[PDB]
Design a protein around this ligand. Structure first.
Ligand SMILES: NC(=O)c1ccc[n+]([C@@H]2O[C@H](COP(=O)([O-])OP(=O)(O)OC[C@H]3O[C@@H](n4cnc5c(N)ncnc54)[C@H](OP(=O)(O)O)[C@@H]3O)[C@@H](O)[C@H]2O)c1
Ligand code: SF4
Lengths: 108, 69, 313, 111, 147, 171, 64, 95, 69, 89, 80
């Protein structure tokens, strides 16, 4: 069958917690070029074994995305993150008042 | 109108007995009401009267505890 | 799991404390004093019936049947008390993939309690009260699903969680004006304490699912039959009432939800005292002949509305 | 769990029957009767057909209940598919049900 | 010792609390038996709830005249009652014929058919006097099960 | 404990024996509730709450119509218990040997079957479906549709018109 | 009089009040943050499964 | 594969049930809905495992037609009792 | 979606090590080429093959409609 | 069909068609091969050329080829008791 | 009037619920064809994506850009 290497792709992969990813839809706008090329590779060639090299760049850019938010305007990001987990899965409902504190700091 | 209705209930509990007296007229007695009393009766009956309320009614009256044996 | 056990024992008490309201409100409706002697306002009498009917009352039927009969009060409680689980509330016990489908299926399964009580006595006297209970329920199951569909297409999907969020500004009584009036009648499909009702009360015929049963099974039937009345009252307060949601404070929802349901809880006992029984034949003529063309015309109307003006979840 | 939620309610319900079954016991005489409710000896022993009266109206329910089940897509299906193509088909099932009930008006039955 | 003695009174408290009557529409006594449901003299949820059906009820009130045509009918109804049962024969007909007694059809005193615990003597049984028929019933229930 | 559907499938066949071994349409009527209701759980565990609870809506409602002819027409003579008759119990005792003796071969190794296919164990393989879809998930998640099968809507509408008119001619 | 009726309503304002509060206030002990996650469809189910897998280990739903 | 073998075994018992007749005619109409119940479970598992989405509409159509025959046969049961007294497989005139 | 494929690859490598450990002496199992005769598309189908051992992890992964937390 | 439909079509019958919304079949990878092999008349009538692709299609829905393979692994793990045991998980 | 006004009041007198069964159900067919708002509801129904977006290879294409906020294809802007 020929399986992938035991070393695996992307060192220290994925974020530590869920919902955190769902709270920020800005990942669609920023860093899309590595994401879309992996997407274009995967639909044309259905094998995960062939387009894992492009998938390495997706996870590497994912770590670069979260580190920028942790450096500048971290306190409005944490307050928005605690708001979404307090409720069930409203995603954008009720937390729109605390969403005003967010984005405005990021706009700087 | 609403203030006088709540005050009428509080005055009824304050007039007859007090704290321990009101509980005796609630747990043992079915309906609690205060007014005029005749007083004098054999064994120890209370016998209350002179109340308006409704037609064919002459207050609580009440039964005595341990009448003969 | 603790939540299920905290939804049977306090709920059985609500069916117990119903017996007060069943003759206190109904009493003042008939200008007579209800519970008074037993407790401070007769409050010790509802809990006294549990000591009265179970511990001391012993009957089992004569000619009887085999395993069935005693199977029926198990079917009475074990299908009507399970109805509390899919309820949305502030927060539901295991939120269903589709909400109202489980509510409609188990309600029709709860009808079997009065059905298996027909074969409780092999004698023909009991099954007349069962055969009457068939038609007084079988016809009203048609509209119960149709009037639901007109409300469900108006707001969200089958999920009961979405039905709370859809009512943020105004109630669903005002858009569904003739449909809300239908759910004072269609709710009384199950054998409930009402004027429309079914073959359960005495009045003219012998008492259905009571003449065959004892005290102990017969006592278990009332703990299920009156339980369905609260269930329909809550279910109307979800589909037609709402007022506010508030996910942050559950305290503001729990008080406001109970008042809306309690006003409806009085309303069925208001119906019970006021009006006579509709007769076996003529209840089949209220619906089917007269109300079914009306509900389907409104069902036709509620199909067009999301297409006319955008209304898709 | 759905299984643990349903069984705990069912086991508590059947346990309450046992409490009312074993505690009250003293004597069981040949006293219990077949019909009860009104009294006297049962003239109609065991079982007899009776039947009729509602035979047509009951049958129609079995026929109608399938259509209401086929109406259940309406709030759940109309999300991805085109509305203009659906409008002609969704109403079509409701229209024909009124036609069947219109044929039910010309002699409904004994009920 | 003390818990056992008080538990027997707790079971007897349930019969002291509530007892469901039977609507024996037997004679004129049954009309005054309907006056127990009438508001002016009420036992409605004071300790009495009308529901009928001999299988569910605890107390049966024989309300009037019994005949030889009715002697087999009432007997098995008493047998259809749960074992803790009380019979209140209300009226002179229930106690041995109002007049009658020396008549051909009327059975004398109900006690020939079914045993009675509490007697009410009143022809037109005044609702005032009828109230004892349930209040004395509760007072008579004192002790059950010693061993 | 690992098996969820397999234990329910035993109860499914259990109610089905009370059909070949005729127990009258009251004890045999119970089968459509007992094995029918558990039969919904077989559908529910695989997925799709709609089609799983769709069995509850008709096979209980339509059974009430059947119940409208259990206390009617023919069967009202004797209850006829499946534990009393010698001709009935003989079919049940051989009926249980068609089910319970089969489970004896399931435990340890693959079970012996009349068909060519082997049963094996299959605990994790019982689901045999990956996650794949997320938003608007499940094939049963968007099951019923008026689109694509437009011809199927017309004939179903026709067949439910025919019956109402036809039964009127019979009666 | 309503002074007899209102204790019949007030006793219902305690027993029927329980199932609402008992479901909500139990989320403090069961989960960290007084919330039980809604499942519905596999998308929301997968988010819970990866949360329990990622450094929460034993806990089903946990922040960070 | 594994789950299919149990519901196929339930089909065979209901197959015999439609071919076995004793006294009443009511057993057949239970088995008609019984056999359709066993086919419905078989259809539900086959379509959902190897996902179809389009063909998951098909058992819903099948479930409609499942009681289409059952309603007509149950209405035919009514008219036999009117001509005779009680519906019996044992009681027939035609040769 | 990458997180799905990251887990599926790691599960495959765990299965490859288990097959080599169990089969060594008498039994014939190559594991190469796999079951499919096509060997060009190579479908994942990690539901029946995924997790060969440990009951607690397998039961949670298989059931989603059941329990539904 | 004894008589076929012209102009108007009432298809949506065969596997791997235009999906209900967008969701594809679980066996869609093997479904595509069967249409590509049997589009010509002299393939299914011959039933020899498409024998390779039909056997791969049998593996998808029934999973019988994978069932007997996974049965051998689970049996050997149960057979080896108290002698040679490994548990990486 | 022969049947427009003369026969309509006869339905109101005997069995008046029959009037509502024809009028409300009748308007449910006429309104979705003539009213100029029905086409807007289908537009949002097609715009709402259920499945994930698919990337296509670009080789001389018009109205196609990056995922970032730019004028590409069409993009829904019908009422806010
Ligand atoms: N098996 C038979 O049928 C059989 C065969 C051969 C001979 N016999 C003879 O026939 C007689 C049948 O009588 P039985 O057994 O039918 O009577 P039983 O049912 O035992 O009834 C006797 C009653 O007397 C009371 N009693 C007796 N001893 C008591 C004590 N020490 N303290 C308080 N109360 C007491 C009991 O009241 P409590 O329940 O309130 O204590 C009980 O209700 C026997 O005496 C026997 O010699 C019987
Ligand atoms: S005792 Fe008097 S009132 Fe009672 S039934 Fe006899 S005659 Fe009538």
């Amino acid at each position: 069958e020929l399986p992938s290497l035991e070393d695996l792709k992307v060192q220290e992969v994925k974020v530590s917690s869920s919902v955190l990813k769902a709270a920020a839809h800005h990942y669609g706008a920023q860093c899309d070029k590595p994401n879309k090329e992996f997407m274009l590779c995967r639909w044309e060639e259905k094998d995960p074994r062939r387009c894992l090299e492009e998938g390495k760049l997706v996870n590497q850019c994912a770590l670069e995305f979260f580190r920028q938010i942790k450096r500048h305007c971290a306190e409005p990001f944490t307050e928005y993150w605690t708001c979404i987990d307090y409720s069930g899965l409203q995603l954008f409902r009720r937390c729109r008042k605390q969403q005003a504190q967010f984005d405005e700091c990021v706009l700087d | 109108e609403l203030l006088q209705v709540l005050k009428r209930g509080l005055q009824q509990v304050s007039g007859h007995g007090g704290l321990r007296g009101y509980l005796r007229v609630l747990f043992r007695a079915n309906d609690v009401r205060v007014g005029t009393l005749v007083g004098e009766d054999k064994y120890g009956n209370k016998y209350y009267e002179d109340n308006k309320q409704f037609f064919g009614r002459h207050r609580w009256v009440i039964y005595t505890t341990e009448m003969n044996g | 799991m603790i939540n299920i056990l905290m939804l049977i024992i306090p709920i059985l008490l609500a069916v117990a404390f119903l017996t007060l309201v069943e003759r206190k409100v109904l009493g003042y409706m008939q200008l007579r004093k209800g519970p008074n002697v037993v407790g401070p306002y007769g409050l010790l009498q509802p809990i006294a019936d549990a000591i009265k009917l179970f511990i001391k009352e012993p009957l089992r039927p004569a000619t009887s049947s085999a395993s069935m009969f005693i199977l029926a009060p198990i079917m009475a409680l074990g299908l009507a008390l399970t109805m509390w689980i899919p309820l949305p509330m502030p927060y539901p016990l295991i939120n269903m993939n589709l909400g109202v489908l489980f509510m409609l299926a188990m309600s029709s399964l709860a009808v079997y309690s009065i059905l298996w009580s027909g074969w409780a006595s092999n004698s023909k006297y009991a099954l007349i009260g069962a055969l009457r209970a068939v038609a007084q329920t079988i016809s009203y199951e048609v509209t119960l699903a149709i009037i639901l569909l007109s409300v469900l297409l108006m707001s969200g999907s089958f999920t009961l969680s979405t039905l709370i969020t859809t009512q943020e500004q105004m109630w669903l009584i005002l858009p569904a004006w003739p449909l809300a009036m239908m759910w004072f009648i269609s709710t009384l499909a199950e054998t409930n304490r009402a004027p429309f009702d079914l073959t359960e009360g005495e009045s003219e015929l012998v008492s259905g699912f009571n003449v065959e049963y004892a005290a102990g099974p017969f006592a278990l039937f009332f703990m299920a039959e009156y339980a369905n009345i609260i269930m329909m009252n809550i279910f109307t307060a979800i589909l037609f009432l709402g007022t506010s949601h508030n996910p942050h404070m559950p305290e503001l929802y729990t008080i406001n939800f109970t008042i809306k349901s309690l006003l409806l809880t009085m309303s069925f006992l208001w119906i019970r005292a006021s009006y006579p029984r509709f007769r076996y034949d003529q209840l089949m003529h209220l619906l089917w002949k007269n109300f079914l063309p009306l509900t389907l015309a409104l069902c036709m109307w509620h199909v067009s509305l999301p297409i006319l003006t955008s209304g898709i979840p | 769990n759905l299984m643990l939620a349903l069984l705990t309610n069912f086991t508590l319900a059947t346990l309450l029957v046992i409490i009312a079954f074993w505690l009250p016991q003293l004597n069981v005489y040949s006293e219990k009767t077949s019909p009860y409710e009104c009294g006297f000896d049962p003239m109609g022993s065991a079982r007899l057909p009776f039947s009729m009266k509602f035979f047509l109206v009951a049958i129609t329910f079995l026929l109608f209940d399938l259509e209401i089940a086929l109406l259940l897509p309406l709030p759940w299906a109309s999300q991805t598919a085109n509305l203009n193509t659906m409008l002609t088909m969704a109403l079509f099932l409701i229209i024909l049900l009124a036609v069947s009930l219109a044929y039910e008006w010309t002699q409904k039955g004994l009920e | 010792e003390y818990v056992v003695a008080k538990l027997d009174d707790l079971i007897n408290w349930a019969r002291r609390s509530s007892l469901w009557p039977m609507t024996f529409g037997l004679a004129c006594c049954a009309v005054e038996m309907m006056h127990m449901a009438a508001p002016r003299y009420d036992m409605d949820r004071f300790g009495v709830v009308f529901r009928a059906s001999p299988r569910q009820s605890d107390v049966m009130i024989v309300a009037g005249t019994l005949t030889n045509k009715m002697a087999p009918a009432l007997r098995k109804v008493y047998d259809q009652m749960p074992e803790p049962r009380y019979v209140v024969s209300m009226g002179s007909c229930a106690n041995g014929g109002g007049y009658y007694h020396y008549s051909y059809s009327v059975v004398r005193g109900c006690d020939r058919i079914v045993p009675v615990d509490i007697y009410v003597p009143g022809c037109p049984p005044t609702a005032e006097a009828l109230l004892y028929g349930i209040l004395q019933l509760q007072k008579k229930i004192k002790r059950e099960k010693r061993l | 404990m690992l098996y969820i559907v397999f234990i329910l499938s035993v109860i499914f066949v259990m109610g089905f024996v009370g059909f070949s071994s005729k127990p009258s349409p009251i004890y045999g009527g119970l089968g459509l509730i007992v094995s029918g209701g558990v039969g919904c759980g077989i559908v529910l565990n695989f997925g799709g709450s709609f089609l799983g609870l769709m069995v509850f809506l008709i096979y209980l409602g339509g059974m009430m119509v059947v119940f409208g002819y259990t206390t009617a027409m023919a069967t009202e003579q004797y209850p006829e218990i499946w534990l009393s008759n010698k001709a009935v119990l003989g079919a049940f005792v051989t009926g249980l040997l068609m089910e319970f003796f089969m489970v004896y071969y399931v435990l340890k190794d693959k079970e012996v079957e009349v068909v060519f296919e082997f049963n094996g164990l299959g605990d994790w393989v019982i689901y045999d479906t990956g996650d794949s879809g997320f938003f608007s998930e499940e094939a049963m998640g968007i099951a019923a549709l008026y689109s694509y099968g437009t011809w199927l809507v017309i004939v179903t509408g026709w067949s439910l018109l025919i019956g109402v008119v036809v039964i009127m001619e019979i009666t | 009089m309503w002074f007899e009726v209102l204790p019949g309503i007030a006793v219902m304002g305690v027993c029927l009040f329980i199932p609402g509060m008992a479901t909500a206030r139990i989320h403090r002990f069961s989960n960290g943050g007084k919330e039980k996650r809604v499942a519905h469809y596999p998308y929301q189910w997968y988010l819970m499964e990866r949360d329990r897998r990622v450094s929460g280990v034993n806990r089903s739903y946990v922040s960070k | 594969s594994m789950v299919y073998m149990n519901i196929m075994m339930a089909f065979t018992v209901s197959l015999v049930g439609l071919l076995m007749y004793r006294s009443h005619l009511m057993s057949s109409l239970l088995c008609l809905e019984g056999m359709m119940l066993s086919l419905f479970v078989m259809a539900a598992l086959t379509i959902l495992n190897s996902h179809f989405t389009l063909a998951s509409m098909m058992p819903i159509i099948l479930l409609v037609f499942a009681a289409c025959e059952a309603a007509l046969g149950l209405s035919l049961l009514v008219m036999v009792s009117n001509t005779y007294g009680t519906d019996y497989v044992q009681n027939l005139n035609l040769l | 979606l990458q997180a799905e494929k990251d887990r599926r690859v790691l599960q495959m490598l765990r299965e490859n090590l288990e097959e080599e450990a169990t089969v060594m002496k008498d039994x014939x199992x190559x594991x190469x080429x796999x079951x499919x005769x096509x060997x060009x598309x190579x479908x994942x189908x990690x539901x029946x093959x995924x997790x060969x051992x440990x009951x607690x992890x397998x039961x949670x992964x298989x059931x989603x409609x059941x329990x539904x937390x | 069909q004894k008589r076929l439909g012209v102009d108007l079509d009432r298809w949506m019958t065969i596997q791997s068609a235009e999906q209900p919304h967008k969701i594809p079949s679980r066996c869609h990878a093997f479904e595509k091969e069967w249409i590509e092999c049997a589009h010509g008349i002299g393939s299914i009538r011959a039933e020899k050329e498409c024998k390779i692709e039909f056997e791969d299609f049998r593996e998808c829905l029934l999973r019988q080829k994978t069932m007997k393979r996974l049965h051998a692994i689970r049996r050997q793990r149960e057979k080896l008791i108290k002698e040679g045991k490994y548990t990486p998980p | 009037a022969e049947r427009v006004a003369a026969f309509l009041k006869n339905v109101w007198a005997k069995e008046p619920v029959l009037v509502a069964s024809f009028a409300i159900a009748g308007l449910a067919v006429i309104l979705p064809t003539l009213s100029p708002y029905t086409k807007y509801s289908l537009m949002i129904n097609x715009x709402x994506x259920x499945x994930x977006x698919x990337x296509x290879x670009x080789x001389x294409x018009x109205x196609x850009x990056x995922x970032x906020x730019x004028x590409x294809x069409x993009x829904x802007x019908x009422x806010x």
